[PDB]
Amino acid sequence: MLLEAIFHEAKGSYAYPISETQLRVRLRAKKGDVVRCEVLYADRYASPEEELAHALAGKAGSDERFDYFEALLECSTKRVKYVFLLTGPQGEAVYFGETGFSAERSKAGVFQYAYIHRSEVFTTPEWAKEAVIYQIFPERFANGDPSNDPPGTEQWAKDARPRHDSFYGGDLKGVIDRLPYLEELGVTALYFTPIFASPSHHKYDTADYLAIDPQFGDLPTFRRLVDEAHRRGIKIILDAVFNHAGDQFFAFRDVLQKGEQSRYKDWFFIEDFPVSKTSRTNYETFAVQVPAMPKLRTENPEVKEYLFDVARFWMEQGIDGWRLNVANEVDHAFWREFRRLVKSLNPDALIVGEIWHDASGWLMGDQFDSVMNYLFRESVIRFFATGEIHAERFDAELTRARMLYPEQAAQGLWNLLDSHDTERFLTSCGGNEAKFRLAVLFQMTYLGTPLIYYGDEIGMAGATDPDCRRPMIWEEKEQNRGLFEFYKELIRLRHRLASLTRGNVRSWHADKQANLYAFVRTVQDQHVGVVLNNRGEKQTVLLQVPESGGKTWLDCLTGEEVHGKQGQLKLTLRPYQGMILWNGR
Ligand X SMILES: OC[C@H]1O[C@H](OC[C@H]2O[C@H](O[C@H]3[C@H](O)[C@@H](O)[C@@H](O[C@H]4[C@H](O)[C@@H](O)[C@@H](O[C@H]5[C@H](O)[C@@H](O)[C@@H](O)O[C@@H]5CO)O[C@@H]4CO[C@H]4O[C@H](CO)[C@@H](O)[C@H](O)[C@H]4O)O[C@@H]3CO)[C@H](O)[C@@H](O)[C@@H]2O)[C@H](O)[C@@H](O)[C@@H]1O
User: Given the rule CB under 6 A, which of 140-148, 270-278, 285-293, 387-395 is the region that contacts ligand X?
Assistant: 285-293
**Residue 28 amino acid letter:** R
CA atoms within 13 A on the CB side of 566: 1
Q: How many CB atoms lie within 10 A of CB 286?
A: 19
Question: Which residues within the stretch 308-327 sit at the binding site for ligand X (CB under 6 A)?
Answer: 325-326
Contact string 380-419 vs ligand X (x = CB under 6 A): ----------------------------------------
Contact string 53-92 vs Ca ion (x = CB under 5 A): ----------------------------------------
Residue 145 binds what, of ligand X, Ca ion, none (CB under 5 to 8 Å, by partner type)? Ca ion
Choose which of 290, 498, 523, 557 interacts with ligand X (CB under 6 A): 290
303 Rama sector, left if φ>0, alpha if ψ -120 to 50, beta otherwise: alpha
Question: Which residues within the stretch 100-159 sit at the binding site for Ca ion (CB under 5 A)?
Answer: 143, 145, 148-149
- The whole-angstrom separation of Cα 188 and Cα 194 is 19
Largest CA distance in the chain: 82
Strands in 370-371's sheet, in edge-to-edge order, are 370-371, 350-353, 321-324, 235-240, 189-192, 133-136, 449-453, 414-416
Contact between 280 and ligand X (CB under 6 A)? Answer: no
Question: Which residues within the stretch 415-444 sit at the binding site for ligand X (CB under 6 A)?
Answer: 420-421
Provide the minimum distance between the beta carbon of 168 and Ca ion in the complex, in angstroms, as a whole number. Answer: 8
Which of 572, 501, 584 is closest to 543 using CA atoms?
572
Residue 286 binds what, of ligand X, Ca ion, none (CB under 5 to 8 Å, by partner type)? ligand X
Cβ-based nearer residue to ligand X, 241 or 543: 241
User: Given the rule CB under 6 A, which of 71-79, 283-291, 342-350, 387-395 is the region that contacts ligand X?
Assistant: 283-291
Question: Which residues within the stretch 292-311 sit at the binding site for ligand X (CB under 6 A)?
Answer: 292-293
Residue 139 binds what, of ligand X, Ca ion, none (CB under 5 to 8 Å, by partner type)? none
Secondary structure (3-state) at 378:
helix
User: Given the rule CB under 6 A, which of 39-47, 53-61, 197-205, 223-231 is the region that contacts ligand X?
Assistant: 197-205
Size of the site for Ca ion (CB under 5 A): 6
Residue 576 binds what, of ligand X, Ca ion, none (CB under 5 to 8 Å, by partner type)? none
Contact between 286 and ligand X (CB under 6 A)? Answer: yes
Contact between 204 and ligand X (CB under 6 A)? Answer: yes
Pairing verdict, β 449-453 and 414-416: parallel
Provide the minimum distance between the beta carbon of 445 and ligand X in the complex, in angstroms, as a whole number. Answer: 26
Backbone angles phi, psi at 408, to 5 degrees: -60, -35
Contact between 287 and ligand X (CB under 6 A)? Answer: yes
User: Given the rule CB under 6 A, which of 34-42, 60-68, 354-362, 523-531 is the region that contacts ligand X?
Assistant: 354-362
Contact between 356 and ligand X (CB under 6 A)? Answer: yes
Choose which of 63, 145, 171, 205 interacts with ligand X (CB under 6 A): 205
Size of the site for ligand X (CB under 6 A): 18
Residue 202 binds what, of Ca ion, ligand X, none (CB under 5 to 8 Å, by partner type)? ligand X
- The whole-angstrom separation of Cα 55 and Cα 71 is 6
Handedness of CA 448, 341, 246, 156 (dihedral sign): positive
Question: Which residues within the stretch 157-186 sit at the binding site for Ca ion (CB under 5 A)?
Answer: 169, 171
Handedness of CA 258, 211, 367, 187 (dihedral sign): negative
Residue 203 binds what, of ligand X, Ca ion, none (CB under 5 to 8 Å, by partner type)? none
Cβ-based nearer residue to ligand X, 404 or 541: 404
Choose which of 200, 221, 298, 411 interacts with ligand X (CB under 6 A): 200
- The whole-angstrom separation of Cα 550 and Cα 529 is 11
The DSSP-derived string for 160-204 is ----TT------HHHHHHTHHHHHHHT--EEEE---EE-SSSS--
- The whole-angstrom separation of Cα 395 and Cα 383 is 10
**DSSP assigned state of 560:** -
Question: Which residues within the stretch 79-98 sit at the binding site for ligand X (CB under 6 A)?
Answer: none
Secondary structure (3-state) at 31:
coil
CB within 8 A of 143, min separation 6: which ones?
149, 156, 168, 169, 170, 171, 174, 471
Contact 364, 332 (CB under 8 A): no
Contact between 454 and ligand X (CB under 6 A)? Answer: no
Q: How many CB atoms lie within 10 A of CB 94?
A: 19
Choose which of 357, 476, 477, 565 interacts with ligand X (CB under 6 A): 357
CA angle 56, 57, 62 (to 5 degrees): 155
Contact between 68 and ligand X (CB under 6 A)? Answer: no
CA distances (Å), 173 to each of 73, 144, 156, 183, 345, in order? 52, 5, 16, 16, 28
Provide the minimum distance between the beta carbon of 321 and ligand X in the complex, in angstroms, as a whole number. Answer: 16
Provide the minimum distance between the beta carbon of 320 and ligand X in the complex, in angstroms, as a whole number. Answer: 20
Residues that bind Ca ion (CB under 5 A): 143, 145, 148-149, 169, 171
Residues that bind ligand X (CB under 6 A): 164, 200, 202, 204-205, 286-287, 290, 292-293, 325-326, 354, 356-357, 420-421, 465
